[PDB]
Amino acid sequence: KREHEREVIQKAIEENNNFIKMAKEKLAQKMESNKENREAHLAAMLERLQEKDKHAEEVRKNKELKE
Amino acid sequence: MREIVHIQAGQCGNQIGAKFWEVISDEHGIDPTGSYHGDSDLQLERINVYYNEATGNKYVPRAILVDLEPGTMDSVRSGPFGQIFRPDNFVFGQSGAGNNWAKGHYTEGAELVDSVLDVVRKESESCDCLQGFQLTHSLGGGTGSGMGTLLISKIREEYPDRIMNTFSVVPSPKVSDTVVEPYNATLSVHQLVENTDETYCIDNEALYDICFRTLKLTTPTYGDLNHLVSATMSGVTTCLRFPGQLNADLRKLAVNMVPFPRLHFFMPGFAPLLTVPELTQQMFDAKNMMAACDPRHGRYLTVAAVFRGRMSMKEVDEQMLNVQNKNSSYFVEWIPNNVKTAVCDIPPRGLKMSATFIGNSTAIQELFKRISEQFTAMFRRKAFLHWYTGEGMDEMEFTEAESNMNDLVSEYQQYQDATAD
Amino acid sequence: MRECISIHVGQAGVQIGNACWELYCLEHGIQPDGQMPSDKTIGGGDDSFNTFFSETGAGKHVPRAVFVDLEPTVIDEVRTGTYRQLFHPEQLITGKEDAANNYARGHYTIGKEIIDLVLDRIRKLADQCTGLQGFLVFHSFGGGTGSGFTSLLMERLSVDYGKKSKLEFSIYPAPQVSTAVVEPYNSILTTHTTLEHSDCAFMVDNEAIYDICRRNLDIERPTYTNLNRLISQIVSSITASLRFDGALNVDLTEFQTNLVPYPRIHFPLATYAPVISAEKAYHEQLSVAEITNACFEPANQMVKCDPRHGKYMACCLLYRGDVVPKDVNAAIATIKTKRSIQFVDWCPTGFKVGINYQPPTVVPGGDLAKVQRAVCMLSNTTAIAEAWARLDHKFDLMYAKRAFVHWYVGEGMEEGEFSEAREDMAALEKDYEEVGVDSV
Ligand SMILES: Nc1nc2c(ncn2[C@@H]2O[C@H](COP(=O)(O)OP(=O)(O)OP(=O)(O)O)[C@@H](O)[C@H]2O)c(=O)[nH]1
């Protein structure tokens, strides 16, 4: 009975800790996956705006190189 | 969030912009020198949105006055509230655009754009918390149409997470009979669908028709059109400008009005051009739309309604519910609670009770279809292309702009035809 | 000890906190500057009101509470208003830019910039405590901060405080008061991401509080001030057990033993009475029998559902004022015969009773009449799943077309998080269905 008394309280700690662990990790997974996703969105937005500039350089050369 | 940075490009943008600044200065208790002569604390409480606080309690617009033609600088400065503007915020070019979008966007306007951006960067940096930008311009001209949609694009590179509003003035034969405005609008619309968060389609054909039919004027000036455009621009900013129990910023409006990121072209409305049930029926009536479309030819994805004046808020709640009940077919079933309503105590000057309407309706395709018809009339026989291909553009870019605007129409149709089950 | 730290998140929370803390001060005879004349132990004490108020050496009674909002307008009114002296400046926390009705901005984008500061400020209150019991979290389901930042906070508190109890007072959205188009999305998103981390959650349907103010207080178009002053009386009835001495006072954790049969089934239906105007209450004394019978009239519920077309797993009656056991017992006996109260076959059908003697107060120039007795019923009914149903349908109508989902994806969320949340809600609806079924 004494070894069972310790087996219960050790288990109580184990699962309390496990809940903190898998909460702590699941939250880290989300905040990293999010930051990757948000920057992926803003990088593609800026890459489409940087592609517009290169097109406006082809238009400004087709005026110069058609005279 | 609080501060908006205003930009007026071209002639139309500067005139409708000037009217906007006269009207909201009047409502906030501001005179052409820039002193608070009012009475209510409500006038000042969210003054920071559109004004900077210079020394000696001076209130100065956060506006950036731009055009490739001078003289527009003079008419704005000679006009009623010309004094109040900040002198370095004027950024004016030399030779003008001559109704050429390719000049405004790619060649001539591309030179001036950097010194415009400097005034933006100077104003934006001094904001406590910059929320976004608003552009007043036309899609028919050269500067506002072309250089405006470049500034949109360029401001998006340095402020990609800020809101980008536009009051885009859509062209019409009935008001202005230049032959290549259908080309300029369609080229602008190709930029607006990609680079703005919400665009108020202010339409000249709607403005002419309202001036003729409702307001009884036999042949109307640009002054008569802009009495409306100013009252509309006064209405949709009312919630940003004053307190109420709603907070109101550009993000929350944009979030709630824009179900899909391309479909952000609002159909404004105003009433009267009086009792609450009349007001309510007037603002949803097709005659009061500042875009040339019938709401009964599509469905409302989202609507925002702003009432101004002392009135029973219990009566307004009952009435807006009434029109949704009775006209249930003209709102989409798959977006619940998709019509919102704010009330401001302080009415506009002149009227005791006004009502302002903002609707993202699928019936806007009717406007884009009209511009597509006038465009495709010219383009399919290659008419007037030398103006543009001279300045360096490909024919490919006219096809892609034609295609992207027809996609926008097709998408507004997709969601009009969408059902719940 | 047995201290209780209150966190108010976003406008709704903040504004309900103003109501709640104003009311608590009137109940304990605390002045707006924080002084308590009746408190003789200067600097500290082991009294029942000390569960919600710490004391300074100067004698200021300071709420054990934090106010957070991602924009300053709403908290700034606390900072300049009547009770500005009551709070230390560091209990009032703001950013500059809000979450814009976006769970994504409240949980991630704007939220991650202030989360550490908030937990640091909660921690400073926790270290004043000799025997912390847990947290009360006040927020809206609808708002970006109320949904997003709350969820973030709840997750982080589970890390820092382990299994230490966390109760919610959630404001369920309704179109009568302000609503946004995307509130169903925020509601499902926060309800999913908080469900593991909340021990008990009292939902408050704004429509229910709206209808009550219209019907019972004769208020034509109720304001937030009207709704919050009613809400705070219900909040006070639940927390009264923690704040007052009492022979026949049952503690709120003891009711929770009965109210929560499984961990996910932690959503009690609050029902309060009497809500009555000064005009109608004149020469009209409402007995224990009358107010107890009103608890089963569903027009007095904090959440719109029909308990009569569901099944009970728990019934608790929290009386305050001039009440004694005898009358309560008579009143319950009356109800058992005349009313539609079916329990599940696995629960015992008793009603658990508590009584505080400290009679219920009202805010001066309020709409509620001062009454000699009052009662808040907390029941665990399967009917409350109807609130999840109405909200889940609205979610489904928009999500079918992906309406507005780009605002969330833009700020870093995936489509997976929507379906994950919605399937959790589908499970929760099925759990509330399964518990009602009879055994074999
Ligand atoms: N409603 C309204 N429309 C206007 C006004 N002024 C010009 N427009 C319209 O604007 C279109 C032409 O654009 P403008 O703004 O005049 O030209 P711009 O953008 O300055 O370009 P450039 O003149 O080439 O420098 C026409 O269709 C006009 O009907 C005005 O005050 N009100």
Ligand SMILES: Nc1nc2c(ncn2[C@@H]2O[C@H](COP(=O)(O)OP(=O)(O)OP(=O)(O)O)[C@@H](O)[C@H]2O)c(=O)[nH]1
């Ligand atoms: N009962 C009650 N409900 C409120 C109050 N304020 C807001 N709400 C409700 O809360 C929801 C909106 O969320 P808010 O709490 O205002 O927003 P927030 O948490 O500040 O989030 P953001 O402003 O988006 O950062 C809507 O359902 C409103 O009806 C209040 O004082 N009382």
Ligand SMILES: CCOc1ccc(-c2cn(C)nc2-c2cc(OC)c(OC)c(OC)c2)cc1
């Ligand atoms: C159909 C959905 O439309 C909505 C919902 C909400 C809002 C909104 C939310 N807040 C906090 N503020 C606004 C708001 C509302 C307005 O008109 C009713 C405004 O005037 C145009 C406004 O100014 C930008 C903000 C908006 C639309």
Ligand SMILES: [Ca+2]
């Ligand atoms: Ca003491």
Ligand SMILES: [Mg+2]
């Ligand atoms: Mg010009």
Ligand SMILES: [Mg+2]
């Ligand atoms: Mg807020």
